[PDB]
Every structure is written in structure tokens, then in C-alpha cells.
Amino acid sequence: ALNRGDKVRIKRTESYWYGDVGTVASVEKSGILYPVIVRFDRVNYNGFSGSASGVNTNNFAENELELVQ
Amino acid sequence: ADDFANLTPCSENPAYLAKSKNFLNTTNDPNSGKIRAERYASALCGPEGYPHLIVDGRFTHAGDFLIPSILFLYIAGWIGWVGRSYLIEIRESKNPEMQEVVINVPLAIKKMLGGFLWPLAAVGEYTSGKLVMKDSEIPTSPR
Amino acid sequence: MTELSGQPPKFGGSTGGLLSKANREEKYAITWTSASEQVFEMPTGGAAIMNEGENLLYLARKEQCLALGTQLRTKFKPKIQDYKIYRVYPSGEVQYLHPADGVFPEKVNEGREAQGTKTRRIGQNPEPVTIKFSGKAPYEV
Amino acid sequence: VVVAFGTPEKQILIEPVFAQWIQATSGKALYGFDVLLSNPDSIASTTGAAWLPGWLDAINSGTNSLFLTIGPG
Amino acid sequence: MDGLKSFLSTAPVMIMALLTFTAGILIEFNRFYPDLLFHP
Amino acid sequence: TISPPEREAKAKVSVDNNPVPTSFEKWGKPGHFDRTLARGPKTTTWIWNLHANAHDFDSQTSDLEDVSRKIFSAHFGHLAVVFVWLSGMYFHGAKFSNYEGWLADPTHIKPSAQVVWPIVGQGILNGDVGGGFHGIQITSGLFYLWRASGFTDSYQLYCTAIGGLVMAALMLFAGWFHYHVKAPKLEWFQNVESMMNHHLAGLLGLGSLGWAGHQIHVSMPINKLLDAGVAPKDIPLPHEFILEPSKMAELYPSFAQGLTPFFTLNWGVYSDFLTFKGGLNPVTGGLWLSDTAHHHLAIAVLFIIAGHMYRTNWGIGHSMKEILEAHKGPFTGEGHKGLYEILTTSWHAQLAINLALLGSLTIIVAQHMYAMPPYPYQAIDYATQLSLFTHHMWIGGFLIVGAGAHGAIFMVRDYDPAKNVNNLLDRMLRHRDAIISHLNWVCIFLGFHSFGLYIHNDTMRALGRPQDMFSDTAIQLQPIFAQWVQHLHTLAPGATAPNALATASYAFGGETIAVAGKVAMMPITLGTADFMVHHIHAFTIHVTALILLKGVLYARSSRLVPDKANLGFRFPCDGPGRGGTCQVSGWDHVFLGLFWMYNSLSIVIFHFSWKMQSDVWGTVSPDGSVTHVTLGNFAQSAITINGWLRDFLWAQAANVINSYGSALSAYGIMFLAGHFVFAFSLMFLFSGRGYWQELIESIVWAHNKLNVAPAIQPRALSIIQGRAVGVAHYLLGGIVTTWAFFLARSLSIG
Amino acid sequence: SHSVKIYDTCIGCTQCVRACPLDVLEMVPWDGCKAAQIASSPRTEDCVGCKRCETACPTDFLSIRVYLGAETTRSMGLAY
Ligand code: CLA
Ligand code: CLA
Ligand code: CLA
Ligand code: CLA
Ligand SMILES: CCCCCCCCCCCCCCCC(=O)OC[C@H](COP(=O)(O)OC[C@@H](O)CO)OC(=O)CCCCCCCCCCCCCCC
Ligand SMILES: CC1=C(/C=C/C(C)=C/C=C/C(C)=C\C=C/C=C(C)\C=C\C=C(C)\C=C\C2=C(C)C[C@H](O)CC2(C)C)C(C)(C)C[C@@H](O)C1
Ligand SMILES: CCCCCCCCCCCCO[C@@H]1O[C@H](CO)[C@@H](O[C@H]2O[C@H](CO)[C@@H](O)[C@H](O)[C@H]2O)[C@H](O)[C@H]1O
Ligand SMILES: CC1=C(C/C=C(\C)CCC[C@H](C)CCC[C@H](C)CCCC(C)C)C(=O)c2ccccc2C1=O
Ligand code: SF4
Ligand code: SF4
Ligand SMILES: [Cl-]
């Protein structure tokens, strides 16, 4: 029940953004475990040692989110 | 009562009164040593000739700790409050990180010059609810 | 597999190659065809000249073979994608390793089995208090 | 920095009041806070305690390690 | 031009200008009124 | 920018007209030189990586023609920096010193060229050096240089500072010009034959030529009067000597003949100022300037002649390519083939040679200045002697490790295996294990047979067994070779050097020269305590060479990592696998070699400082006897570790800790401060960033609790940066401790 | 030998296999992601544990995990 541009809070525990709130980028069709692709304002840890930043996007599931807006 | 019996004022202390006549000069003023002899002669001293400060909370020595404590806390709250407010102000402008690396001087100065009322602003943000956050809305790690 | 045909590369010998344990315990060989005669760096040290056509070289361990393979296709315009890595036993037993099913493990391919595949998230691993005193780990179950 | 500049008269020497006062609460009179066992009129001294005369003599003799006199260091 | 006005307002230039200014303040204050172990 | 005409005359000059325009918009954009950093900071690490790659021009751009034009202007900027610094010294000597007050009575006053502002008690740092002047006693030996150069008035030093600032402006301007107006092409650079011709004939030849001319017209005729007993105000000016060439013709008998004999091959007549006396000056304790002018003239002729060996445009001359392609034997196959192309393309290949040679030559400078003091009254100033020696030791020690760094950089970035097929480099890459394991064995041997001797001596003297020690009074370890060459240099003026009147240095053997009440230089008797410490030095240098060599011979690959060349020069590891792949890159090898260079020089400088105070330096009696400071216990106490712990450290450190309340209190402060920074480095060197990032997580939660977290997400230092901060603070604290200790100790010996 | 697992959060981008230097990892057709593939680890006997796969993972936290275990001649990376 999501669309492009919704504010959702991550509830994936092990996620780097667990507790943070990101923006939905695009949702893929059915047949995928994690179709909800979310962008974030803050990069994660990803990257080799000494990297400049990280990744600010990831796929999640609907039972792992919570709309805010 | 006879609080600090082992401490005698610098005006009565033996070693302090011996050393006060032979005080060095910090600045260019040659009287600065005798200036110290006259200035520190009011504090409590020990049997070695060096002044001691009592910070247990008594008002007799409120000039020892209370005044610097208050003056610091004022200036430090000023610093932290203008920093926090400017950090929040950046969060709505273009590129929240570039303006943290390159300072918006016309904005940073405008926020610095409005910091002498940081206690009132902080209480107004706590009553309205802007000072603190909610635990259920902060990114936390797995327990 | 049946035979390891190939010409030894032009190289003046180095001390970084295989040793006594590498001949008695196990060694690795790689076979490839070169479009022409060129110079390539040795994973053990120095620069060698690969022969035109089918080549053969024996190395100590597998990572050296794969490091040479990743060099062959990336540095030269006539890229070598037919390099085949074999493990040699002390009894002459030679078996195929890389590439596995004739196709590089990069791209997908039909006819492979799911090995080490789990149907959960990492944050869904069981608690170590439930499996203690058993010879199993939170990831092995 | 203050001692190296020939000015030992500017050292921030904080008096350990909160601990010397506790010492006074057990009978140490070198500081003279007149609190509890340091005060002869506290009801803690008129209890007929058999251990009081020994403790009061042991604490204030300047020969033992029982509650040593402390300072800014 | 603004290209140099942005460089003069960078993090290191400004964080050293403030430190120099505060050093001047403290040094002049402890020149005219030194040796303030406490408040009289 | 501007537009000059052309400035060429049938030359290999090749430039590009205004390649890089002049603008300030790139100044407000930090990290623009890197593509990975231009998109904006997302973590705090982005900041660190900004400085870690500020000068690395290879990662920035791949065009070598751009990198060379960057490097040229970078050198110009460095020269501007240097000229600014030097004008600083000349101006502080002109208006903030007592050079005039020292030149009058140089044996009863101390050099000082700094005045501390009296504030918050720091005015106590102005020590009475003598003559009414109050300031910091300097140890860089600037007054001795300015006396040996002919400086006599403050206006001279003032004009020197003005000229230095003018040259700084000129170098700064030339840097901008050779990158924003007319930046040279590659045709102007890759003439290594031409560049060597010009750098030998013009730079090092004409330089010493002109300086010898200066000395003959400035330094010699004024230092001759200074050494006689004439007041500086009564001594004439240097230009009064050329305005009146008769005053120069009279002051030297050879000058009383004219200039024609030199052109008519009558050199022997100029023996009245181009002398070969040798030894030292009994008035000042330094080298004879009449010998230095002759020496600079000889070096000038030699270098100008050397600048005419390589081929340029007129056909004659050599090509280094030919010489390298010619040298090949049955042991190395093709020999030096391809080396010209290596050193004409890779800047790191060139820097790995230049840094090595420059550091070695700085060490040679220290070792030659300490024993043959070339400046007046510097051998009496033990502080200045020690300071120059140790400073030129440390500079060279750093510049040497720079070579082992840039060699690995060349290996990872510029080594083309197709260009090195069976030559020196390629064949050396083959038997890497041979050389490395042999050096491993040599280092183990030198560790057992140099340090184990000290351990054995400590255990024997501790057990109460004197007849079982390696001392001058037991199992003697006398150095025969060094004593033999000492005796050779002593008998030089009467055998293998008939024209030489005195020995090169009095350290080998001979007379004992002393100025005022202190000694300048005397024979340095070498015994067991010298043999053992020399072998200690050899061992430490061997281990440092082993480390910095395995850093280059394995930057490409190894049996552990066969694809290491892909990982680059600077990288922390390749995972905890293979048992543990931590610190395998050449960067990590330089990180390790820094510590061993420090540990080697730590024993070198202590050997110097104790041997000089024990068997050389000391007050001289009017009857003739010489009593050393530590009473000559080096030959009898420096043989055990407890001797160095007690009679060297504990004994001579007393000046630093007891310095409070005096003008040397700053040295005790910096002693404790270096002790602080040393231990501060251990926090980085012993830990790992995985703990610090987890802690930053909690502090970030705390900041977000009050909503005060920076958009620049805070990230702990990278593994490489952690190690770099660790080694940097280690070296800083150690060198600050030793600097404070050495200066406070040397200033307190009179 | 080391243990290599692949979780359902994998998007099948072959990056961990493109980074593996010992041909330990492969790619099998799956039905979870757009690419319809998931990482596989058939030849764990050649896994040294250099973590080059985990470094090259895009998902929020790893989708492939390496757990070091009983080290052997092949896992220790012994070439002598
Ligand atoms: C606006 C800036 C700002 C503000 C409001 C705060 C506020 C706070 N910090 Mg903090 N911090 C800052 C910057 C700031 N920090 C920076 C730049 C660093 C890196 C050095 C840190 C590193 C840091 C650590 C390690 C910790 C805190 C902690 C804390 C909390 C306890 C206060 C404290 O520890 O005493 C004082 C805080 C410090 C001594 C840290 C340095 C403070 C810097 C130097 C002042 C920043 C000035 C800033 C540039 C002003 C900008 C003005 C603007 C107009 C341009 C508190 C809410 C503690 C915590 O977790 O909470 C319990 C703690 O452990 N901070
Ligand atoms: C006012 C004169 C001026 C101006 C407007 C510019 C402008 C520019 N220069 Mg440039 N340059 C100048 C003078 C100038 N330069 C001089 C005098 C030199 C000789 C040293 C150079 C050598 C030079 C090189 C080699 C390069 C540039 C580059 C650039 C461009 C990017 C600069 C940058 O990264 O941000 C600004 C950088 C700084 C503000 C650095 C801060 C100063 C450092 C930290 C130390 C200062 C050393 C200084 C040169 C000497 C000290 C002076 C002495 C008194 C001690 C930019 C448009 C780069 C380019 O073209 O992009 C690819 C490039 O590679 N310049
Ligand atoms: C003229 C000599 C010379 C030159 C031209 C270079 C040039 C270069 N070196 Mg290099 N190097 C040299 C000598 C030289 N080096 C020596 C002697 C050593 C041995 C110590 C090294 C060791 C070394 C290493 C390990 C590395 C380089 C790297 C580099 C490249 C990037 C520089 C950089 O990181 O940006 C700017 C440099 C910095 C930001 C360093 C700042 C930190 C300094 C050291 C702090 C020092 C403190 C100060 C001096 C004293 C303390 C006072 C304090 C209280 C303020 C660059 C092309 C890097 C590279 O990747 O190569 C391609 C690399 O990692 N060098
Ligand atoms: C003399 C060595 C030294 C020093 C100074 C420190 C200092 C510190 N350690 Mg530490 N540590 C050390 C050795 C040292 N460690 C070693 C050898 C180990 C074993 C590897 C550890 C392991 C360790 C752990 C595991 C932890 C610490 C932590 C800390 C911090 C605790 C905060 C504090 O003390 O309050 C105040 C800070 C100080 C008193 C030090 C600051 C001193 C400077 C001079 C203040 C002024 C700043 C200066 C002017 C900057 C400008 C520089 C400019 C000149 C370029 C602190 C900064 C804990 C931490 O991170 O705190 C949360 C932590 O968990 N340490
Ligand atoms: C302190 C010394 C007093 C103790 C005596 C020690 C004797 C030293 C052994 C003799 C010198 C050996 C090198 C010449 C021998 C020599 O260089 O011959 C020349 C030979 C190659 O020459 P080519 O015939 O190829 O000549 C063509 C060249 O132009 C390049 O193509 O080099 C080698 O032998 C490679 C093997 C090096 C490995 C041997 C070196 C041993 C390392 C230790 C050296 C100690 C030197 C100490 C000096 C301070
Ligand atoms: C009586 C007194 C002392 C005794 C003091 C007592 C014992 C200390 C008590 C401390 C108590 C336990 C803590 C006090 C307050 C704790 C709350 C949580 C404070 C929160 C402050 C935060 C919310 C402020 C945040 C933002 C404030 C508003 C302004 C800053 O710019 C910036 C920034 C930090 C973001 C002794 C030591 C005995 C000596 C005696 O002479 C005087
Ligand atoms: C002698 C000491 C000198 C240093 C001390 C004086 C500092 C003076 C600060 C300059 C004041 C102007 O203030 C500075 O204006 C520039 C204009 O480019 C702003 O710059 C910002 O906005 C401009 C447009 O307005 C953008 O094009 C630019 O990319 C961005 O960085 C800075 O965010 C602000 O800090
Ligand atoms: C403490 C620590 C950190 C954390 C270190 C940090 C966060 C550095 C702190 C830097 C602060 C924010 C800046 C203060 C220092 C400045 C560089 C000094 C400049 C002062 C001028 C502005 C005057 C690591 O990241 C680390 C990594 C690997 C091994 C060990 C360690 C380690 O021990
Ligand atoms: S990188 Fe990770 S998530 Fe992507 S295909 Fe490989 S194992 Fe799966
Ligand atoms: S841990 Fe390293 S060696 Fe093992 S599968 Fe992953 S990338 Fe390959
Ligand atoms: Cl001893």
C-alpha cells in the first residue's frame, strides 16, 4: 500500500537504518521477497577500508516497514 | 565552626608571607609580583606557602569556584546552543553536508549573535518539545 | 583431464615457484591458448613470455592460477577466456576445477546446485542458548 | 606550566573537603570540622562504647597510616 | 569574486580565525589582568 | 593571463599557451582534484581522505604531461616557502638577536636569536646569555655561519632577509607562470642528458665558483682580521676591497702579482691564499677559510667539467641510453637495458633514487661537520655541534625511508613487466626469496653478535664476574681496522700527502685543539665500547634495510597474495583469511620501517652524545691535561645496558627534570610532553577501528537523542589512517623527548 | 574448512563472485530477485576467508556470510 515518495521507518533490526526513516524510491511488481526499494539521506558502512562513503539505498519488505509522513 | 583548622589565611601563613616578598613578574609590570603578594593574600593557604581553594559549596569561597563555574557554563551553553541551532538550520538548505564543510558566515554569525538568550530558547524548546527526541524515532542497534 | 597438452612458457626460472611439498602433496596446473607470442607477468615473480597457441604452466596453489587467469583476460586485447585450471595429485590424478561447468562462475548458468543457500535473514539466526552443548553453530543449523 | 615559570604561587590547589570531612566524621581533629565523632557533644560519643577510647587515640596520632592527612595532590 | 569568498569561509580557515581571535582575547585579558586564580 | 613574446633561440623549448586559466572558484571546492571526493562529504572519513591524497597526482590524473607540470610548480612553491623561512632567520638575526654583541667577545657569551614576549610568566624564558641580552640561546649555529660569511652589521642581515623575501616572491611567481601562462611540454623535460649537463656545469659548478669568489673577496679578508683581534667596527667593508684592489693585493702576497699568472699556468704562485693547511684554526676552532675557498674553486672546476659528458644538440657527448644498453654481463643477462626508459617515465622511480641519495648525503654532512668543524667557534659550542649533527641525522633518516616508499609506489603503479624482460630489475624480481631470506639470516646474526654481547656483559657484571666481560679490562674486543685507518690519517701530512700540512680531522689522531677553556676536537680512541656500539648500529640498519626492501620486492605479489598488485600501494590487508593477511602492502612496510629507522638513529645519537661527553669533550687545564665530562667512563661503562640506563639516561637527564624555575624550563615541559605523545600513539598502535566505530555508534545515538548529529556521518579513522596517526605520534613524542633532553643537557655543560 | 552461506536478501548481482579470487562462489538461477539468481558456494574447500565477497555486497548488511572455521593447508593459503 505504498507509492513513490512515502516516508517509512525501517524495522529490520540488523539493518543499518533500523530506527531511521528513509524515502521509497520504486516498488517492484509481485514475485519478489523484498520489492520495496528505499533511499536514505545517510550512507551506511558499505565500502572498502578508507572509502569516502557508502550505499544509501536498499530493498525491504512491507512487514518490515512503518509509514510516517 | 573552625572549618579548615589546618589552613591559615595567606595573610597569616608563614611560608606564604616569606615567599610573597619574592614574587616573580609575569607581565611587563615590575609590581606584578608585589601585586600578587597583595592579591592572593586574602585566600586560605597551607603550611607550604601556596594558596588553597575550597569548593565544598560554601559562599565564603564563592569566588574560588562558583564564579568561574557560572561563567564557563554560560559561555559553553552559548557555544553549544548556537552550534545546535545552526546545525538544525543547515538541514533545510541545499546540501546538508557541504554547508557543514563550507560555513555560511552570514548565517553562522546571525545565529551566534542570538545566543545570549540560550536558556530561554532551550526552555521554550523543551516545553514545546524541540529540545529532546523520542526513543521510538531514533536509529538504534540490535539488542 | 586425459592429457595436459601445452608448451611451457619462456621463463628463466625463479625461486617463487613450486617446492618439495608442492610436488609431493599437491600442485596446480593451468592450460590456455595464446593468440600470439607476448609477455605476461608471473604470479610468482618476474615477467615471462607465453608461447603461441596452447600453453601449460604448473603452480603451487589454486589462487595463483586464478590470479593469472584474471590477468590474462583483462590486460591483453586478444583476451584469453579458455584458460583451464587443473589440480594435480601425487598419483597423477588430474581433475577439472576452473572453469567448473565450462562457463565462468560470474554469470549464471543452468545445471548448478544451491550450496550454502539459506531461507532466512542474518538477523533471524537462532539464539546460541538454544543450541549450546550441541556440535552445531547458529549458522550451521 | 605555572611552576616552570618561577611562579609557584598560582597553582590550582583544590582542598579535598568532602573526604577530610568524612575523616572528621570518625574522629580526625587535624581539620576541625566538629562533626559527629570530631565533636565532643554529639550523642555518638556518650554511648559508653568500649571501642571509642582506642579508636580516638589511634586515629589522631601522627605516627600511623590510619586515615592519613590529605591535600590537593 | 565569490570563489575566494567561499574559500575564506571554509572550515579550516574559519576554525583557525576563531582560534586566533580567541587567543588574542585571552592573551590581552591576561596581559592587562593576569594572575586570576579565583575571583576576589 | 599575460602574454610574453617567445623566449627561445633554436632550443628544445616546448610550452603550451595558457593551459590552465586563473580563477578562484576551485578554491571553494575542496577535494575537487579527486573524482571520488567531488560529490560531497557523506562521512567524516571523506575529510581525512582529502588530505591523504592531496599531493598524489597519479590517482588524480593519468596524463604524465599534466603531472610533470604540476610537479615543477610544486617545486617552485616549495622554494618560495624555503626562501620565506630563510628571510625569517636573517631578519631575526638582524633585529631580534645579539650577533654584534657575540662577535665582539665570542668566548664569553652565548648565541641567541629569539626574544620571548613577557606574558603570563613566560618572560622567564629569556635567559641571560651575556652582554646584557636576554633571550633563548640558539643551537642552529647561525652566528657562526654569519661570521664565516663576513656579516658584521645588522643592516647586512636585514638586506639578506629582504633579498630572501624577493626570491620567495620570484619562486612563487615562477610556479604560477609554469602552470597557468606557459607550461612546458614533454619535449622540454625528458632530456636527462641535457638536464644532467646543466645541473652539473651550471648549478653545482658555477655555484661553488661564485661562492669561492665571494670568500676570496668577502669571507677571507675579513675573517683574517677577526681572527687577529681587530674590532668589527674597525674592519673595512667587502666592497672597499674591490674599490681598492691594492688593499687586497697587499693583504695576500700572491695577490701582489696580478691575474695573468693564473691564465699562464702559474697556479703555484697563488699559494698565499689558496692554501692546503688542513686541520683547524687555533683562533676559532674551525676549518681554515683559505682552504675552503681553494676547495670550492676545485669543486667548481670539477663540476663544470663534469657538465660536459652527455649529448645535447651539437652531436658530441654521451647518451645514458647507450651506456645502459652497453653494460651487460653473463651474470645479469641484458643488464641495464630498459633502465633509461624506467627513469625517464616513472617519477617514483626517480624519487626512490633521489631520496635515498639525499638522505645518505645528509647523514654524510652530519658525520663530516661534526669531526671537521667548518664554522668558527662551533666546536666550542657543544650544543650547536650536537644540534646540527642530530638534526642532519634525522633529516637524512626520513629522506632515506622515503626512497623505500616511492620504490614500492613505482613497482605497483609504473612497473610494466613487458618493458622489463630479463634485465636487472626483472631478474631481481625472480629470486626475491633468496635475497630476503639471506638478509633475514644476516639480521639475525647481527642481532645475536652485537646485542647479545651487551646482555652477556650485564649478566656478568651483575653476577660479580669481571674477568668474563667484553670490556677493555677483560675479554677485549679491540677494533683493529678503525684504529689502523685512524693512524693512516694521522701520518698523512708526511707520506701520502706531502702538500697537506695537517690531518683532515684530529679525531683520527694528533694534537688537541682547544679554544677558550673548552676543547674543539681531539683523537677519538676506539675500543671495545666502540666496537660493540658500531655493530649495534650495523644490526639496526640491516633490519631497517630488510624491512624497507621486502616492502618493495613483494609489493607486486607473494606466495601469500599473488594478486597484490591489483590492491594498490596503500591498503590495510586482504582479509583475516589465510591465517591473517594484516600489513602486507608496501605502505605497511614503510609504516614498520619508520620505527626501525627511529630505533637505529636513537642508538646512533646516544652513541654520539655519550662518546663525545666521555672520551672527547671536556675542559682543558692550563698545564695541558684534559678532564672529560663523564670522566671517561664510556670505555668502561657504556658496555652494559645498565650503564646506559644509569650513567647515560638517569645521570644526564637530571638537567631536564631540574629545569623548572630557569630559562631551560621549556625543555623539561617538552620532555614530559613528548613522553605524553609517545604513550598517546600507543592507543592507536595497539587497537583496531572496529571498537571505535561501535563506540561512535553510541555517541551518534546520544547526539540524535538531542537531535545534534552532523549530516557528515562520523566514521572512525580507516585502518591505514589509524596506523599512520599511531606512527606519526610515536615519532613526534619520541623526537620531542630526545630534542628537549639533548638541548637541556648540552646547554648545561658550560 | 570455512562456512559460506547466502541469505534470501541476496539480489543476485554476481559482485561477490566477481571479487572472489579462488573460484569458491558461483551463481545459480533463483526466483527471488529481478535477476532471478542467488549466490552459491559449492567449493568451500578452496575458501581462504579473505572476506573479498562480503566487501563486495550491496544489500543492507551482508547477504553472504563467511564464518571462519578449522583452518587447513588450503584455507591457510599455504604455498610452500
Ligand atoms: C554543535 C556542536 C556540538 C554539540 C551541540 C555537541 C553536543 C554534545 N556532545 Mg559533542 N562533539 C562535537 C560537537 C558537538 N557536540 C564535535 C565536533 C565532536 C568531535 C570532536 C564531538 C564529539 C563528542 C564526543 C566524543 C562526545 C560528545 C558528547 C556530546 C553530548 C554531551 C556534551 C559533552 O560531551 O560535552 C562537550 C562536548 C565535547 C567536548 C566534544 C567537542 C565539542 C566541540 C569541540 C564543540 C563544537 C563547536 C561547534 C563547531 C560550534 C558550531 C557553531 C556554528 C555556528 C558554526 C552533547 C549533547 C558526549 C556524548 O556522547 O554524550 C553524553 C561524548 O562522548 N561529543
Ligand atoms: C592567486 C593565484 C592563483 C590562483 C587564483 C590559482 C588558482 C588555481 N590553481 Mg594555482 N598556483 C599558483 C597560484 C594560483 N593558482 C601558484 C603561485 C602556484 C605555484 C606553487 C600554483 C600551482 C598550481 C598547481 C600545481 C595546480 C594549481 C591548480 C589551481 C586550480 C585549482 C586550485 C585548487 O585546487 O584550489 C586551491 C588550492 C589551495 C588554496 C592550496 C592552499 C595553499 C597550500 C595549502 C600551501 C600554499 C603553498 C604556496 C603555493 C606557497 C607558500 C607561499 C609562501 C609565502 C610560504 C585553480 C583554478 C591545480 C589545477 O590546475 O587543477 C588541476 C594544480 O594542480 N596551481
Ligand atoms: C620530496 C620528498 C617527497 C615527496 C615529493 C613525496 C610525495 C608523495 N608522497 Mg611521500 N614520503 C616521503 C617523501 C616524499 N613524498 C618520505 C621521506 C617518506 C617517509 C616518511 C614518505 C612516505 C610516504 C607514505 C607512507 C606515503 C607517501 C605518499 C606520497 C604521495 C601523496 C602525498 C600525500 O599523501 O599528500 C599529503 C601529505 C600529508 C597530508 C601528510 C600530512 C601528515 C604529516 C606527515 C604530519 C607531520 C606533522 C608536522 C610535520 C610536524 C608536527 C607539528 C604539529 C604539532 C603541527 C606524494 C606524491 C602517499 C602515497 O600514496 O604515495 C602515492 C603515502 O601513503 N609518502
Ligand atoms: C598517554 C596515552 C593515552 C592517552 C592520552 C589516552 C587518552 C584517552 N583514551 Mg586511551 N589508551 C591508551 C593510551 C592513551 N589514551 C592505550 C595505550 C590503550 C591501549 C591500546 C588505550 C585504550 C583506550 C580505550 C579502549 C579507550 C581509550 C579511551 C581514551 C579517551 C578517554 C577520554 C578522556 O580521557 O577524557 C579526556 C581526553 C584526554 C585527557 C586526552 C586529550 C588530550 C589532548 C591534549 C586535549 C587537547 C586537544 C589538543 C589540543 C588537540 C590539538 C592537536 C594539535 C596540536 C594538532 C582519552 C582521550 C576511551 C575513549 O575512547 O573514550 C570514550 C576508550 O574506550 N583508550
Ligand atoms: C666490509 C667488507 C670487508 C669484508 C669482506 C667481505 C667481502 C665481500 C664480498 C665481495 C663483494 C661481492 C660483490 C661483488 C660481486 C659482484 O657484484 O659481481 C658482479 C655480478 C654481476 O656482474 P656482471 O658480470 O653481470 O656485470 C654486468 C653489470 O654491468 C650488470 O649487467 O653481481 C653479482 O655477483 C650478483 C650477486 C650479488 C650477491 C653477492 C653480494 C654479497 C652481498 C654482501 C656484499 C658485502 C659488501 C660489503 C661492502 C661494504
Ligand atoms: C552543589 C554544586 C556542586 C554539585 C553539583 C551536583 C551534584 C551536580 C548534579 C548534576 C545532575 C545529576 C545532572 C544535571 C542535569 C542533567 C540533565 C539531563 C541535563 C541535560 C542538559 C542537556 C539536555 C543540554 C543540551 C543542550 C543545552 C541546552 C545547551 C548546550 O549548549 C547544547 C546542548 C548540550 C545540546 C558541587 C560539586 C558539590 C560543588 C558545589 O560548590 C556546587
Ligand atoms: C583574513 C581572514 C579571512 C577569513 C575571515 C573572513 C571570512 C569571510 C567570509 C566570507 C563572507 C561571505 O560569506 C560566504 O559567502 C559565500 C559566497 O560564495 C557563501 O558561499 C555559498 O553560497 C554561494 C552563493 O551565495 C555559492 O555560490 C557557493 O558555492 C556557496 O559556498 C558562503 O557560504 C558564505 O560563508
Ligand atoms: C581513537 C581511535 C580512533 C578514533 C579517532 C578519531 C575519531 C580521531 C579524532 C579526530 C578529532 C575529531 C579531531 C581532533 C584532532 C585534530 C586533527 C587536531 C586539529 C586541531 C586544530 C583544529 C587546532 C580510530 O579511528 C582508530 C582506528 C584504528 C586504530 C585505532 C584507532 C583509535 O585508537
Ligand atoms: S554480492 Fe552479496 S547480495 Fe549480491 S549476488 Fe553476491 S552474495 Fe548475493
Ligand atoms: S571469503 Fe574470500 S576466498 Fe572465501 S568465498 Fe568469500 S571472497 Fe572467496
Ligand atoms: Cl653498569
Short mmCIF file of N, CA and C in Angstrom, two decimals, chain F residues 130-168:
data_model
loop_
_atom_site.label_atom_id
_atom_site.label_comp_id
_atom_site.label_asym_id
_atom_site.label_seq_id
_atom_site.Cartn_x
_atom_site.Cartn_y
_atom_site.Cartn_z
N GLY F 130 74.52 36.73 28.25
CA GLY F 130 75.73 37.52 28.38
C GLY F 130 75.69 38.82 27.61
N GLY F 131 76.35 39.85 28.13
CA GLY F 131 76.39 41.13 27.46
C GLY F 131 75.14 41.96 27.58
N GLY F 132 74.25 41.63 28.51
CA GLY F 132 73.02 42.37 28.70
C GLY F 132 71.84 41.90 27.87
N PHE F 133 72.04 40.93 26.98
CA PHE F 133 70.96 40.43 26.14
C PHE F 133 70.23 39.30 26.85
N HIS F 134 68.90 39.28 26.68
CA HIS F 134 68.05 38.27 27.31
C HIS F 134 67.21 37.61 26.22
N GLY F 135 67.39 36.30 26.06
CA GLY F 135 66.63 35.58 25.05
C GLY F 135 66.93 34.10 25.12
N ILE F 136 66.46 33.39 24.10
CA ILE F 136 66.65 31.95 24.00
C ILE F 136 67.98 31.68 23.31
N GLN F 137 68.85 30.92 23.98
CA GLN F 137 70.14 30.56 23.40
C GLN F 137 69.92 29.59 22.24
N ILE F 138 70.29 30.01 21.03
CA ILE F 138 70.03 29.20 19.85
C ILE F 138 71.11 28.13 19.70
N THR F 139 70.75 27.06 18.99
CA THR F 139 71.66 25.95 18.74
C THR F 139 71.82 25.61 17.27
N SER F 140 71.14 26.33 16.37
CA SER F 140 71.26 26.06 14.94
C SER F 140 72.57 26.55 14.35
N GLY F 141 73.37 27.30 15.11
CA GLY F 141 74.65 27.78 14.63
C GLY F 141 74.54 28.76 13.49
N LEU F 142 73.74 29.82 13.68
CA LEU F 142 73.61 30.85 12.67
C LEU F 142 74.66 31.94 12.80
N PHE F 143 75.07 32.26 14.03
CA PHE F 143 76.10 33.28 14.22
C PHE F 143 77.44 32.82 13.65
N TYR F 144 77.74 31.53 13.76
CA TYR F 144 78.99 31.01 13.21
C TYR F 144 78.99 31.07 11.69
N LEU F 145 77.86 30.71 11.06
CA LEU F 145 77.74 30.85 9.61
C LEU F 145 77.87 32.31 9.18
N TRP F 146 77.20 33.22 9.89
CA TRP F 146 77.23 34.62 9.51
C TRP F 146 78.60 35.25 9.76
N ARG F 147 79.37 34.70 10.70
CA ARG F 147 80.75 35.16 10.87
C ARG F 147 81.65 34.62 9.77
N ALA F 148 81.50 33.34 9.42
CA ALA F 148 82.27 32.76 8.33
C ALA F 148 81.89 33.32 6.97
N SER F 149 80.74 34.00 6.87
CA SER F 149 80.32 34.62 5.62
C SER F 149 80.69 36.09 5.51
N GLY F 150 81.12 36.71 6.61
CA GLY F 150 81.54 38.10 6.58
C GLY F 150 80.53 39.10 7.11
N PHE F 151 79.43 38.65 7.71
CA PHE F 151 78.44 39.57 8.25
C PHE F 151 78.99 40.26 9.49
N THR F 152 78.86 41.59 9.53
CA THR F 152 79.35 42.39 10.64
C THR F 152 78.35 43.42 11.16
N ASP F 153 77.31 43.75 10.41
CA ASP F 153 76.34 44.75 10.81
C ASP F 153 74.93 44.20 10.65
N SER F 154 73.99 44.79 11.40
CA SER F 154 72.60 44.34 11.34
C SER F 154 71.96 44.67 10.00
N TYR F 155 72.39 45.76 9.35
CA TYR F 155 71.83 46.13 8.06
C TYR F 155 72.15 45.08 7.00
N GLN F 156 73.28 44.39 7.13
CA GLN F 156 73.61 43.32 6.20
C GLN F 156 72.61 42.18 6.29
N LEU F 157 72.31 41.73 7.52
CA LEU F 157 71.32 40.68 7.70
C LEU F 157 69.93 41.15 7.27
N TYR F 158 69.63 42.43 7.50
CA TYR F 158 68.35 42.98 7.06
C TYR F 158 68.21 42.89 5.54
N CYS F 159 69.24 43.33 4.82
CA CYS F 159 69.20 43.25 3.36
C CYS F 159 69.19 41.80 2.88
N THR F 160 69.84 40.90 3.62
CA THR F 160 69.76 39.48 3.27
C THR F 160 68.33 38.97 3.39
N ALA F 161 67.63 39.35 4.45
CA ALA F 161 66.23 38.96 4.60
C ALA F 161 65.36 39.56 3.50
N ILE F 162 65.64 40.81 3.12
CA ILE F 162 64.88 41.45 2.05
C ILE F 162 65.08 40.69 0.74
N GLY F 163 66.33 40.34 0.43
CA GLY F 163 66.60 39.57 -0.77
C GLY F 163 65.97 38.19 -0.73
N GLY F 164 65.94 37.57 0.45
CA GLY F 164 65.27 36.29 0.58
C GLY F 164 63.78 36.39 0.30
N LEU F 165 63.14 37.44 0.80
CA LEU F 165 61.72 37.64 0.51
C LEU F 165 61.49 37.91 -0.97
N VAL F 166 62.40 38.66 -1.60
CA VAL F 166 62.28 38.91 -3.04
C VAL F 166 62.38 37.61 -3.81
N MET F 167 63.34 36.75 -3.44
CA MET F 167 63.47 35.47 -4.12
C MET F 167 62.28 34.56 -3.84
N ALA F 168 61.69 34.65 -2.65
CA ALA F 168 60.47 33.90 -2.37
C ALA F 168 59.34 34.34 -3.30
#
